[PDB]
Symmetry: C2
Subunit: 130 residues, 2 copies
């Protein structure tokens, strides 16, 4: 019962949608303590790898991390839940995002994320006026 | 198994913390379809009540809704989960926030929220530099 990567089926629903707008990716990551590489690192080291490797691609296709906070408390919700990273990445198009997922460099660097995450959420949002 | 309002115990932990900074309240609300007033409305009407009534107080004590998006997809996560409202409210101090929860007007207007929500999350975050 840990969600690390998306479904074949659900990812289609994502590409299916493609309104022209930008998109907001709410990311809720909970790292595991012992990273899970086939082939000794910690979770947070393993995630930072992904980060160091993902960025260059995301920068290039025009992703930007808009907002990001530090988990302090779960005021409403199950005490079990606790996220180690909370942030919103913006992409200018569903197409920009897809093109990243297919990039060689990304594809290799997600192997790191695949090994660092105990559980994640990734929600697609159409940003609105405050 | 639906989380509407915080615990006595956990709310201490909140007041306990009080770093000087601002705070970011990530709000994930899932409205129910038939509102649950003691005393016939829909959920979304019942929530909009809370909104109309909570703003004035929150404006006054210096809360502001910074960001807000519209749920489109759950790319990573359980398909069961689906949020009807996603937003981040900013308060200038843990103290500002508490003082709101105690306000007469708020206290009456949360009765509406109490009746509209099927399930929610409310996470406290110390915002960081992107």
């Amino acid at each position: 019962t840990g969600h690390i990567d998306p479904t074949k089926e659900v990812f289609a629903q994502f590409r299916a949608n493609d309104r022209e707008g930008p998109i907001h990716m709410l990311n809720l990551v909970r790292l595991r303590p012992r990273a899970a590489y086939p082939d000794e690192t910690t979770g947070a080291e393993a995630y930072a790898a992904y980060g160091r490797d993902s960025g260059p691609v995301f920068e290039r296709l025009g992703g930007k991390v808009v907002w990001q906070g530090q988990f302090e408390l779960m005021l409403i919700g199950p005490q079990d839940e606790h996220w180690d990273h909370v942030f919103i990445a913006e992409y200018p198009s569903v197409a920009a995002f897809v093109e990243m997922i297919r990039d060689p460099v990304y594809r290799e660097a997600v192997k790191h994320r695949q090994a660092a995450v105990e559980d994640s959420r990734l929600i697609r949002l159409k940003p609105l006026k405050p």
